[PDB]
Nucleic acid binder design. Structure first.
Lengths: 290, 43, 265
RNA sequence: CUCUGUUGGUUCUCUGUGCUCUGUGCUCUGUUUACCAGGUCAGGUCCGAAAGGAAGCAGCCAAGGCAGAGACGCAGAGCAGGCAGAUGUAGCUGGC
């Protein structure tokens, strides 16, 4: 079930005997470059091999009889702890205000229809808000996906102030008694300042609890520049990894938690609103290495 | 490309052949096949 | 850095650290280590160098007139043809270009900008046409006027898609319709940042047209680009040129002693 | 068992009066017809690399077609409603 690069790196150590300190550095350089082909940054891949190096000398891999079964077991348990550990779900209060931010073509409008059906069958009442005004037919896209699940959508006008949006959200959540509020924002870059200063103002007036970042699985080396800019200026408290249906590995989730320190919650496996399952750090541990 | 080939056989048919499919015999099967660009085995 | 002049256990271990970081291979790196251990030589600096030259070897002058330049996405096929037009015009050859990147946006207009700088005429066409038959009119303009070399450009296609690989077979029989001897030289453009995906690409492009030479670009960075070693082992296809930049004069010939020297550093 | 004037009956064509019936001529309108040497031909094909071309069925359209309401020309075969008109009439019975 392993990849091409990790089938020879762990496979050559079988039936040789006891290893030295120079063999550990020769195996860890292969795991460092196996991550770069699985779409992870070079600065995160260098900080990962220095963590496993200190844990290998503590478990004694030099005096062990089987070296291949120890190194493969240390990377499997270190990657599981670096992604989250176990399957953890967000804390549900009396009034929840969630935010869905991301890049262009990541699928923010697709993830907004998935969270509106998963909590509807448990006992919570959802509510959809569309803050996307720059993209044509974006307010019509969430209206068609909101009629499929049965959740009412709130449409925001062109050129509206952040103080006037809060006046309509607190009015509809009192009469119809809605607890879960889902805000869908527009697609913006990390270096663009006029759009990032408007997002920081929208966070100050409303006051959310859980801010989710929708990141794609096909994101390359630029996965560190997005997670650092959205944490210092705005404030990310959660991560979502969409589009895991193709031949993508999904290594962009490792470069996002190393700089922030915040856990990953949900994962998307299909384009349909029914396709949503919790994040398992055991399933992705055999996909990046496989 | 299987769906557009099935509609292609129905488009070459008349209004009497669509409402009553049992009248399509050996003389009619060759007219529908040559009009759609298909063979006799496809109809 | 590899310490040359120590014990047998430390020289063979530091050699494995430099080869696997240069994108060599799985069964390719395991074959080199078994040949040095059964040799028995004191001078281990010249022993590994004589084995790596034999793995690569099965001015450079072409076998034919029409050359087919192929490749994938993100390698820079249009950038390699701009370097090959500067090298042959200084010797005494009459070169002519041909555009065949009408599938991608601003691909056929990219070779037109480099063609006015080198004063070499390009055979262009509209957007949405066939790149196979636009190469047929380039062979008829070579035999009638009197030109020496011709370089054909291709579109950005992958090895996984079968619909774009059958379109590549239409370019081979188009040049063979006018002149039965041509094509002779088929060159492939690869990148240095590519891992073990470059081995799967070389096996699919040899089954389609038949490769006789491989070129590698972007060698000026941190990547060494030693993905050329497992190709000459199974398929027996030699290496032609190396690219050390983005400029027109940045093209040096293949030296089997200078490529091994920069690989171990 | 002279013919005449008012006056009476058949078998002629006919010429005009306007009707009515049929064929048409063709035309108008409703309806009818899978392929079997019409026109245009969506898809779907084929020929090509393409640019650009071809066959070609549905439909429709035309042409064949089936019937009536048409102004009527052109015409024959029909009756009884017509005051009644034009050159002969032949037989039988009358009335003048």
């Amino acid at each position: 079930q392993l990849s091409a690069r990790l089938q020879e790196a762990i496979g050559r150590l079988r039936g040789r005997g006891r290893i030295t300190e120079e063999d550990l550095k020769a195996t860890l350089r292969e795991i460092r470059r196996a991550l770069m082909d699985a779409d992870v940054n070079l600065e995160v891949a260098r900080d990962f091999v220095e963590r496993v190096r200190e844990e290998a000398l503590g478990k004694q891999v030099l005096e062990s009889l089987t070296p291949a079964e120890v190194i493969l077991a240390t990377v499997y348990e270190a990657l599981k702890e670096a992604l989250g550990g176990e399957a953890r779900l967000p804390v549900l209060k009396d009034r929840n205000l969630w935010f869905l931010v991301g890049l262009q073509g990541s699928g923010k409008t697709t993830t907004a229809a998935k969270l509106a059906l998963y909590y509807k069958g448990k006992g919570r009442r959802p509510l959809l808000v569309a803050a996307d005004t720059q993209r044509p037919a974006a307010r019509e896209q969430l209206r068609l996906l909101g009629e499929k699940v049965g959740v009412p959508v709130l449409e925001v006008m062109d050129g509206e102030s952040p103080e006037s949006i809060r006046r309509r959200v607190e009015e509809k959540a009192r009469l119809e008694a809605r607890d879960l509020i889902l805000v869908d924002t527009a697609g913006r870059l990390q270096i663009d300042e006029p759009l990032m200063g408007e997002l920081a103002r929208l966070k100050e007036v409303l006051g959310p609890d859980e801010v989710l970042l929708v990141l794609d699985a096909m994101t390359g080396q630029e996965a560190l520049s997005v997670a650092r800019a959205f944490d210092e200026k705005v404030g990310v408290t959660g991560l979502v990894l969409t589009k895991l249906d193709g031949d993508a590995r999904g290594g962009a989730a490792l470069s996002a938690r190393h700089v922030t320190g915040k856990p990953i919650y949900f994962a998307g496996v299909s384009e349909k609103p029914e396709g949503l399952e919790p994040f398992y750090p055991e399933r992705l541990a055999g996909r990046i290495l496989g | 490309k299987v769906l557009v080939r099935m509609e292609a056989i129905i488009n070459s048919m008349t209004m009497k052949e669509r409402a009553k499919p049992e009248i399509i015999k050996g003389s009619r099967k060759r007219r529908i096949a040559a009009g759609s660009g298909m063979q006799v085995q496809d109809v | 850095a590899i310490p040359w002049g120590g014990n047998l256990e430390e020289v063979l271990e530091e050699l494995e650290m430099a080869l696997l970081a240069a994108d060599v291979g799985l069964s390719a790196t395991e074959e080199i280590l078994q040949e040095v251990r059964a040799s028995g030589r004191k001078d281990l600096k010249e022993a590994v160098k004589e084995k790596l030259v034999g793995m690569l070897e099965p001015p450079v002058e072409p076998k034919g007139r029409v050359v087919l330049v192929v490749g994938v996405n993100g390698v820079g096929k249009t950038t390699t043809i701009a370097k090959l037009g500067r090298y042959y015009q200084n010797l005494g050859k009459k070169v002519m270009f041909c555009a065949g990147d009408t599938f991608r946006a601003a691909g056929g207009t990219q070779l037109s900008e480099w063609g006015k700088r080198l004063s070499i005429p390009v055979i262009q066409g509209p957007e949405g046409t066939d790149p196979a038959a636009l190469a047929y009119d380039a062979v008829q303009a070579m035999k009638a006027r009197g030109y020496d070399l011709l370089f054909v450009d291709t579109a950005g296609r992958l090895h996984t898609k079968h619909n774009l690989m059958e379109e590549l077979k239409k370019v081979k029989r188009a040049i063979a319709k006018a002149d039965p001897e041509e094509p002779k030289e088929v060159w492939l453009v690869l990148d240095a940042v590519t891992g073990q995906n470059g081995l799967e690409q070389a096996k699919k492009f040899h089954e389609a047209v038949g490769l006789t030479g491989v070129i590698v670009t972007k060698l000026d960075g941190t990547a060494k680009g030693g993905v050329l070693i497992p190709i000459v082992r199974t398929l027996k296809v030699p290496i032609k040129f190396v690219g050390v930049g983005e400029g027109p004069d940045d093209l040096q010939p293949f030296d089997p002693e200078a490529f091994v020297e920069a690989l171990l550093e």
